[PDB]
Amino acid sequence: DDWRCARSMHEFSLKDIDGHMVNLDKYRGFVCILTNVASQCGKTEVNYTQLVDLHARYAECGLRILALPCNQFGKQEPGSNEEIKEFAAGYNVKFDMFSKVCVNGDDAHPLLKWMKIQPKGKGILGNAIKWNFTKFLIDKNGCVVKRYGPMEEPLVIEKDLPHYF
Amino acid sequence: DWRCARSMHEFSLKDIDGHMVNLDKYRGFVCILTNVASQCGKTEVNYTQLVDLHARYAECGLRILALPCNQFGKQEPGSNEEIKEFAAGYNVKFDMFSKVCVNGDDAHPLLKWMKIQPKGKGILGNAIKWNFTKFLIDKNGCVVKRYGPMEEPLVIEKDLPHYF
Amino acid sequence: DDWRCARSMHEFSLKDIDGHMVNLDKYRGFVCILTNVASQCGKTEVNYTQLVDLHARYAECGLRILALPCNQFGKQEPGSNEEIKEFAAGYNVKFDMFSKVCVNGDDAHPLLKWMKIQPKGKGILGNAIKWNFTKFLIDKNGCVVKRYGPMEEPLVIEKDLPHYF
Amino acid sequence: DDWRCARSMHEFSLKDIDGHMVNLDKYRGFVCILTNVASQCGKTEVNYTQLVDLHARYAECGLRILALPCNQFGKQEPGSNEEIKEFAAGYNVKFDMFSKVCVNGDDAHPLLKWMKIQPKGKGILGNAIKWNFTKFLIDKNGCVVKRYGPMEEPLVIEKDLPHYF
Numbered sequence: 001d002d003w004r005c006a007r008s009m010h011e012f013s014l015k016d017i018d019g020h021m022v023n024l025d026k027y028r029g030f031v032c033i034l035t036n037v038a039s040q041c042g043k044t045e046v047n048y049t050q051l052v053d054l055h056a057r058y059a060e061c062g063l064r065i066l067a068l069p070c071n072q073f074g075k076q077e078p079g080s081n082e083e084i085k086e087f088a089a090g091y092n093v094k095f096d097m098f099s100k101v102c103v104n105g106d107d108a109h110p111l112l113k114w115m116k117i118q119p120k121g122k123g124i125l126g127n128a129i130k131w132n133f134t135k136f137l138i139d140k141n142g143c144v145v146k147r148y149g150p151m152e153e154p155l156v157i158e159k160d161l162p163h164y165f
Numbered sequence: 166d167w168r169c170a171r172s173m174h175e176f177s178l179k180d181i182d183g184h185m186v187n188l189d190k191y192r193g194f195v196c197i198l199t200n201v202a203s204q205c206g207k208t209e210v211n212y213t214q215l216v217d218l219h220a221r222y223a224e225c226g227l228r229i230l231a232l233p234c235n236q237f238g239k240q241e242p243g244s245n246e247e248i249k250e251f252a253a254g255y256n257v258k259f260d261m262f263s264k265v266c267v268n269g270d271d272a273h274p275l276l277k278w279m280k281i282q283p284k285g286k287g288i289l290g291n292a293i294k295w296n297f298t299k300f301l302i303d304k305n306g307c308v309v310k311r312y313g314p315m316e317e318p319l320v321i322e323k324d325l326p327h328y329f
Numbered sequence: 330d331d332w333r334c335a336r337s338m339h340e341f342s343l344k345d346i347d348g349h350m351v352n353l354d355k356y357r358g359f360v361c362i363l364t365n366v367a368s369q370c371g372k373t374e375v376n377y378t379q380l381v382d383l384h385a386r387y388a389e390c391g392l393r394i395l396a397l398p399c400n401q402f403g404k405q406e407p408g409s410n411e412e413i414k415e416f417a418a419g420y421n422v423k424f425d426m427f428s429k430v431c432v433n434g435d436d437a438h439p440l441l442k443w444m445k446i447q448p449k450g451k452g453i454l455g456n457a458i459k460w461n462f463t464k465f466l467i468d469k470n471g472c473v474v475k476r477y478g479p480m481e482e483p484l485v486i487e488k489d490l491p492h493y494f
Numbered sequence: 495d496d497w498r499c500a501r502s503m504h505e506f507s508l509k510d511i512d513g514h515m516v517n518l519d520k521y522r523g524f525v526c527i528l529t530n531v532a533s534q535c536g537k538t539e540v541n542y543t544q545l546v547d548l549h550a551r552y553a554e555c556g557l558r559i560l561a562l563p564c565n566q567f568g569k570q571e572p573g574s575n576e577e578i579k580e581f582a583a584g585y586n587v588k589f590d591m592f593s594k595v596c597v598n599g600d601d602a603h604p605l606l607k608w609m610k611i612q613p614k615g616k617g618i619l620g621n622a623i624k625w626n627f628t629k630f631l632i633d634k635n636g637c638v639v640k641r642y643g644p645m646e647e648p649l650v651i652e653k654d655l656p657h658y659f
Contacts, residue, residue: 019246080244082183224452224459224478326403329371329460448543 003110004117008142009034012111014068017085017097024111029140030062031164033157034115036103037067038076038132039087043150047133048091050154055095058158061165062140065095068112070103073131103129118144139164167274168281172306173198176275178232179263181249186262188275188306194226195328196302197321198279200234200267202241203251205296207314212255214318219259222322225329226304229259232276234267237296267293282308303328332439333446337471338363341440343395346414346426353440353471359391360493361467362486363444365399365432367406368416370461372479377420379483383490384424390494391469394424397441399432402461432458447473468493497604498611502636503528506605508562511579511591518605518636521558525658526632527651528560528609530597532570533581535626537644542585544648549589552652555659556634559589562606564597567626598622612638633658 006012009032010025033051038044055065069084071077077084081099088097103112115136116127121144123130135148137157146160170176173196174189197215202208219229233248235241241248245263252261265273279300280291285308287294295314301321303309310324335341338361339354362380367373384394398413400406408416410428417426430438445456450465450473452458464477466486475489500506503526504519527545532538549559563578565571571578575593582591597606599622610621615630615638617623625644631651633639640654 082245086183220454221457221459224480226480326405329403 001110003114006110006114009111009115009138009144010142012109012114014066014101014109014111015099017069017081017088017099019081019099022096022098024142027064027066027138027142030064031140031161032064032066032138032142033154034066034068034136034138035133035154036070036101036129037084037088037097038070038073039079039084041074041076041132043133043153044076046153048088048093051095052091052093054154054158055093058161058165061161063161063165067093067095067097068103068109069098069100070129070132071100072102072104073129076132103134115144120144120146123147124149137161137164167278170274170278173275173279173302173308174306176273176278178230178265178273178275181233181245181252181261181263183245183263186260188230191228191230191302191306193304194228195304195325196228196230196306197318198230198232198300198302199297199318200237200276200293201231202234202237202296203243203248204240205238207297207317208240210317211297212252212257215259216255216257218318218322219257222325223258225325227325230262230302231257231259232262232267232273233264234293234296235264236266236268237293240296279308284308285311287311301325301328330439332443335439335443338440338444338467338473339471341443343397343430343438343440344428346398346410346417346428348410348428351425351427356393356395356467357471358469359393360469360490361393361395362483363395363397363465363467364462364483365430365441365458366396367399367402367461368408368413369405370403372462373405376462376483377417377422380424381420381422383483383487384422387490388423390490392490396422396424396426397432397438398427398429399458399461400429401431401433401458405461432463444473449473450476452476466490466493495604497608500604500608503605503609503632503638504636506603506608508560508595508603508605509593511563511575511582511593513575513593516590516592518560521560521632521636523634524556524558525634525655526558526560526636527648528562528630528632529627529648530564530567530595530606530623531561531582532564532567532626533573533578534570535568537627538570540647541627542582542587545589546585546587548648548652552655553588555655557655557659560592561587561589562592562597562603563594564623564626565594566596566598567623570626609638614638615641617641631655631658 010028013021013023016022051065069077085097102108115121121136131150133150136144137146139145174192177185177187180186215229233241249261267276279285285300297314299312300308301310339357341353343351343353345351380394398406432441444450444465460479462479465473466475468474504522506518508516508518510516545559563571579591595603609615609630627644629642630638631640
């Protein structure tokens, strides 16, 4: 299952926060925000709160949010998936939390390896995820249409959602 | 404060699935509460005898509340969901809870309250001494007996009929 | 005398509380509640009271109750047969009391062996009687139609009686 | 949504006994027995008993059972979804219970209209389900492969399962 031969995110699969394998074609026809999250980061609260806000105002517009806990940046996500799932519930998170994952390097999940090279998924000084809370906007056809940096608070994405709803 | 509670039914625990369980649910049932561990020398003898007790007395009001704990030789290392599948291998049908602490300051309130009850006092101190200490909880949530880590669960059987 | 081949309780005989053998085919045409009883159990008062009540109200509808003393559970029926008869009289029982028997093990009465292997009389984890005051509902043809555990108060059976009158 | 254009059971959705919509696509890769059930029919006991035994013995091989309560046959499913769920729990039902559904006529669920016209789901005279506990054997790809009459006990299906496991 080589990852460079992928046309859409719908072609991948991911374990949710409870270990069950989730096929990503369940987001066909939905606009998604994929982000790597961290519990002990300096921008955890602004991201988790703003994502819950965007999920609430735009859920019935078809907006889904996919949080992928990652540890490769400053070790800011050290707990287990149940500790993270509880941490997310502390923000009233009602979108989809997935299991901890690597986003950079060779052990990175094939999805992240795919998204990092996409025309709108490529980074500035290299395509690597630079820190926690890098955001990717994915359209209804499971295609990367933009990438937001770790400082960019989730509400900067709202002005772009109408182009893909 | 846990020091002033009058019953087990005043506390609440994470079940091993993460959801909160009001132990008031056990009002009217006879309960064996025990701190469990899967890498203990008495892990096999305790899980099988507790399963046997549950199979033969759940129809009598016997509930079993297994609380995983890693504080005794580090013999319960795994996560909750890992512990659940270990318990399932023994065909456990009683109630499994989340890994807690039983001793020290990080210990769960319920067990802090249990270790000071009249029938819950140890011989020298009150701290739970090893894996698989059992507490017999009556129909009203009161500690009526405590069994050492080396007393096999079938020893409790002779004490159950007086409390059904 | 192979109890496995019986198709009805009417095929069996039972010593009553006064010592005289009783052919159970005398119950053909009546709906029967058979229960193992004990005088020193925690659920003794509630069971005797509700069985007497069910008997007082449904004897005119064909309800018969067969109380079988058993001492195999916490040794909660230690008295003699004539002592059990006196204690029973204290509740003004008018249904039928029998001699103390065993309901489990090799020495179990052939009726209880047959009753525990019936489709509607089977147990959860094994067919053995778990404790005092297990109830079995028996139809007019002597066939087990339902089994009730020792917690279940006798009035729980009331909602099932009209189907068999 | 025209049911005549479906090629598989997986293209339909049902309300489970608890009211939650269930994507029948979730049964992809499993062998399914779909049957219309009732609690007061003359064959209720034999079907619930044998389906539970079939499910427990063959869930290890991918056998699922979909029970669709239907009241169109002698009015023998009059209770509510919670009453039906409680009745099925009385038989230790561990397979999937669904909400009460019409299986015949205009108001029938689209899944059952599709099933009756399948080449292997057609009846002897007409395709309409003609009594409670009609069984449809459904293969991994959600195609009807055999239909069993109401009077046929569920255990007659056991000999057919190896062909589709």
